[PDB]
Design a protein around this ligand. Structure first.
Ligand SMILES: COc1ccc(NC(=O)Nc2ccncc2)cc1
Ligand SMILES: COc1ccc(NC(=O)Nc2ccncc2)cc1
Ligand SMILES: COc1ccc(NC(=O)Nc2ccncc2)cc1
Length: 282
C-alpha cells in the first residue's frame, strides 16, 4: 500500500502495536559473540543491545578492537551510517578513535546527557574553548572551536588532533536537544528541520566516511533518524515514490543492527516524518 493512506488505515483501526510486533518477529537474528566476551562487559551500556559480529565497527588496535557500534550500509539509497551507543566513562577515547579511523565528518546526538534524572551518556566533548580534552588511552586531543545554540538543536565545530601524527580534522557536532523525556514529539517539523541541517553540512555525503549517530542505546531515536533519511532519499531516486515501503526499509536496516525503532510510537512517528517530509521536498 501507499504510505499516507496505510497510515490513516492503521490509525483508524488502532493496530500500531500489531504492526510493530510483526516487524519484531520478522527481524534478522545474527550472532554477537564478540560483544558478549567477558573482557567487554564494561564496554556495553545495556546487556540486551549488542552489535552483530558481521557488521560491527573494529577499532584499529591489536589489544582489544571492540566498540558497541554497527555499520548500516544501504545499497540502493547509496548511504551509510554508523549507529552507536552513547559513550561510557571508559569508552570516550574509543569513540573518538572510531570517528578518526572511519574518516567521519559529523556526529549526530539525539539525547541529553541527563534525562529522567539519570545519566544517559558521558560528557564526551568540551564545553569551553579554553578547556580542551585529551584522551590518553587513544592519543587524541579535542578542542571546542565554536558553538551555535538554537531553539531545538545546537551545532558545534570541534577540532580533533591525532597526537601521534599531529594531523588535525574539523568535526561537526549536531545535537538535537528537545526530544521529550517520555514518548515522541507531537510534530515532526523540528526533527525534519534538523535532518536537513545535517544534510546541508556535507556530513552524510560520499566524500566523507559515514556519519556517527547515537542516542543512549543507539537503536531507538537513532533508528528513527536513519530510517527517515533513507526513505526520503529513495522517494527522490525512484520513478514511483509511492513504491517506497517503510516497513521493508526498516527490516533491511535491522539486518545490520538489532532493535532499530524501540516502540510502536517511534514507528508511527517515523511514518509521520517521512509523510510530511515528502511534501516539503517538492
Ligand atoms: C570519562 O572519564 C575520563 C577521565 C579522564 C580521561 N583522561 C584524562 O583526563 N587525561 C588527562 C589529561 C590532562 N590532564 C589530566 C588528565 C578520560 C576520560
Ligand atoms: C566534560 O567535562 C570536561 C572536563 C574537563 C575538560 N577539559 C579540561 O579541563 N581541560 C583543561 C585543559 C587545560 N587546563 C585545564 C583544563 C573538558 C570537559
Ligand atoms: C573523558 O573526558 C575527559 C577526558 C579528559 C579530560 N581532561 C583533560 O583533558 N585535562 C587536561 C588538562 C590539562 N591539559 C590538557 C588536558 C576531561 C574529560
Amino acid at each position: 500500500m501507499e504510505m499516507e493512506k496505510e497510515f490513516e488505515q492503521i490509525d483508524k483501526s488502532g493496530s500500531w502495536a500489531a504492526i510493530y510486533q510483526d516487524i519484531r518477529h520478522e527481524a534478522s537474528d545474527f550472532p554477537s559473540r564478540v560483544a558478549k566476551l567477558p573482557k567487554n562487559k564494561n564496554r556495553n551500556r545495556y546487556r540486551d543491545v549488542s552489535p552483530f559480529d558481521h557488521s560491527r565497527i573494529k577499532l584499529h588496535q591489536e589489544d582489544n578492537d571492540y566498540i558497541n557500534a554497527s555499520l548500516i550500509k544501504m545499497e540502493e539509497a547509496q548511504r551509510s551510517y554508523i549507529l552507536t551507543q552513547g559513550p561510557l566513562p571508559n569508552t570516550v577515547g574509543h569513540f573518538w578513535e572510531m570517528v578518526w579511523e572511519q574518516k567521519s565528518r559529523g556526529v549526530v546526538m539525539l539525547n541529553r546527557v541527563m534525562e529522567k534524572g539519570s545519566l544517559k551518556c558521558a560528557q564526551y566533548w568540551p564545553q569551553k574553548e579554553e578547556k580542551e580534552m585529551i584522551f590518553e588511552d587513544t592519543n587524541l586531543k579535542l578542542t571546542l572551536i565554536s558553538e551555535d545554540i538554537k531553539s531545538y538543536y545546537t551545532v558545534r565545530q570541534l577540532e580533533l588532533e591525532n597526537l601521534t601524527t599531529q594531523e588535525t580534522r574539523e568535526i561537526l557536532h549536531f545535537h538535537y536537544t528537545t526530544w521529550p523525556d517520555f514518548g515522541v514529539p507531537e510534530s515532526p517539523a523540528s526533527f525534519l528541520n534538523f535532518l536537513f541541517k545535517v544534510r546541508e553540512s556535507g556530513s552524510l555525503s560520499p566524500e566523507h566516511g559515514p556519519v556517527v549517530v547515537h542516542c543512549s542505546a543507539g537503536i531507538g531515536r537513532s533508528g528513527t533518524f536513519c530510517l527517515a533519511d533513507t526513505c526520503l532519499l529513495l522517494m527522490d531516486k525512484r520513478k514511483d515514490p509511492s513504491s517506497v515501503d517503510i516497513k521493508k526499509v526498516l527490516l533491511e536496516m535491522r539486518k545490520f543492527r538489532m532493535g532499530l525503532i524501540q516502540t510502536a510510537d517511534q514507528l508511527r512517528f517515523s511514518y509521520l516524518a517521512v509523510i510530511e517530509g515528502a511534501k516539503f521536498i517538492m
